[PDB]
Symmetry: C2
Subunit: 357 residues, 2 copies
């Protein structure tokens, strides 16, 4: 059994990997060694201890990676580096894993000697897991995206912040709400007053999220005007499909909203050739066992295509499918997926299972 | 001074009209008569009392309109009917007002004898007030939309519901949040558990909104797969621009989120000819005194382009402007506007001021 080291396994992403791994009994086929950065198991900074491992899996973060990985690969270490952080995604000797979508690229990469596998951007992975079919048939000319992203993507303190915010917004009008005859306008004045107050907790987001939204995620890239988050759409989607040469356009706006862990995305997809909505649904649905096609019905869309629905599940629903007024080659689609699973922990857990088989 | 009757002035939309009217001292130039449906002022159902009025302004609702308007226009009444409800928007003898955008159509309509003016769909009006410039120069081939709509668009009880929901979601983990060392995963399990519980108030939305989203607004139109809400994009936008003959494509997905009164929209706009982002911003900014162009900077976008920012104000910010990977003719834009003002009460208050001048 291959010897595997785990780093950053106590964090949020790491914690979800552990549980998922335990649920699938992944520890039964490998030799797990756990590291830590504490000075209170081995030290995640002990390059020699890491050198003895066949595989390393980090959920620690980009900083850890940029400091340790180079030193380690320097010693000649021939092992496999599995990372959830973005730090190494674009490198020439690294592949962005999402096996249900790019298994071919991964197999080829293994046979070619690639030793670094990096999980991809939550937004992009959730997108590919949803409309993989389209990309597999080369039916996608481009895709305009608009996202509704969960606080879990920014971090655990960001989730707590969102919750405190909602808490204070209701408490600001708790008595008025119980009164079935109170003024709705006066109530709104109050909640808005609190959202704007000094003591309203916004240190983590840098603005209110609860009862609002933030149409800006990550750093600004002066080059294209995009945000690092928006850029990853074009960049990571193609590298994952193994199409860096003739890249398919993927672009849009990444917006943060008041949800805990599911990212939702509205798509306008330019198909290269006009097909009947009916065929398209099968091409979408048959691609993988997770994507779920939700019929364009109201009660069903309200019960299946929402964060409340998919949170903490591996299901990736896609619905509201239909042709867009711009013509028959234009497709409308809306999807929901859990950020911590297919958007973080799952892909990593999946490439690990493969590496120790 | 022309005699004006007001109906549904005690509702939410009506209440905002009254305050705005009072703030601008609109009652100084007209003779106001107030009606009511109660049997506890005149009766909104007294056709003869209404017949004496020069102008009628209703914020009562489609039902009231479809029952009274016909009977009234039947008596031969030559007055002006001002409605905020959608009931009459498409009729041949009605015009959809948004004077800062379609004053020309309104003037022409007045000179032609049109006596029915209807305020338009909140989403569309907020869109036109934002990117009016583009449409005025005929630089818009089509626009793919994705919205983040406030609860106020569905109603006052829907706002209270959203607030109770946020309230219960925080109260479900209130103690754990105070504990700076508590598990973020356990907390999420709990809040999600409450969101999914039986006693979680979702009667008004028919699903959770707080901590989630609902990608379905209004009724389903079997004809195109759109929702009545999504359809109004193509329909109302063109009628407002007076272009029903050669309609510009406007389509997308209308999604409801946890915000009180501002609708936000992400746009992918196909310009018919490639212009430098710099020129485009002026064309956008100069159109009206409300639209506000927010530079593509982080701190600024977090302080100006959000519901928290524009709620209860007449300002209509538009930002995140830049070219989209699909090519130089593709523009990205994000905007925020108050639903109860430019999306409901303002247009109505504006056509009234004109009618009594």
């Amino acid at each position: 059994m291959k010897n595997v080291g785990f780093i950053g396994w106590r964090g949020m992403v790491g914690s979800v990997l552990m549980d998922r791994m335990s649920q699938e009994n992944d520890f039964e086929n490998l030799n797990p060694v756990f590291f830590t950065t504490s000075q209170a198991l081995k030290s995640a900074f002990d390059i020699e201890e890491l050198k003895k491992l066949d595989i390393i899996v980090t959920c620690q973060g980009g900083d850890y990676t940029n400091e340790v990985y180079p030193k380690l690969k320097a010693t000649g270490w021939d092992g496999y580096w599995v990372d959830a952080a973005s730090a190494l995604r674009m490198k020439d000797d690294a592949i962005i894993v999402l096996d249900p979508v790019n298994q071919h690229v991964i197999s080829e990469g293994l046979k070619k000697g690639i030793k670094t596998f990096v999980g991809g951007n939550c937004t992009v992975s959730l997108m590919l897991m949803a409309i993989g079919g389209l990309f597999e048939k080369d039916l996608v000319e481009w895709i305009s995206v608009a996202t509704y992203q969960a606080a879990s993507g920014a971090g655990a303190k960001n989730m707590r912040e969102l919750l405190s915010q909602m808490g204070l917004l209701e408490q600001a009008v708790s008595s008025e709400l119980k009164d079935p005859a109170s003024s709705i306008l006066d109530i709104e004045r109050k909640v808005t007053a609190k959202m704007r107050a000094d003591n309203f907790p916004t240190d983590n987001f840098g603005a209110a999220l609860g009862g609002s939204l933030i149409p800006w995620i990550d750093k600004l890239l002066p080059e294209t005007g995009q945000t690092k988050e928006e850029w990853k759409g074009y960049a990571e989607t193609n590298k994952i499909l193994g199409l860096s040469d003739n890249p398919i356009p993927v672009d849009g706006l990444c917006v943060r909203i008041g949800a805990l862990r599911c990212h939702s995305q509205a798509f306008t997809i330019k198909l290269k050739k006009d097909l009947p909505l009916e065929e398209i649904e099968q091409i979408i649905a048959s691609h993988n066992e997770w994507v779920k096609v939700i019929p364009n019905d109201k009660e069903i869309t309200l019960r299946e295509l929402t964060p409340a629905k998919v949170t903490g599940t591996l299901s990736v629903p896609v619905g509201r499918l239909r042709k867009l007024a711009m013509g028959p080659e234009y497709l409308a689609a809306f999807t929901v997926g859990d950020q911590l699973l297919w958007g973080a922990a799952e892909p990593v857990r999946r490439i690990l299972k493969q590496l120790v088989a």
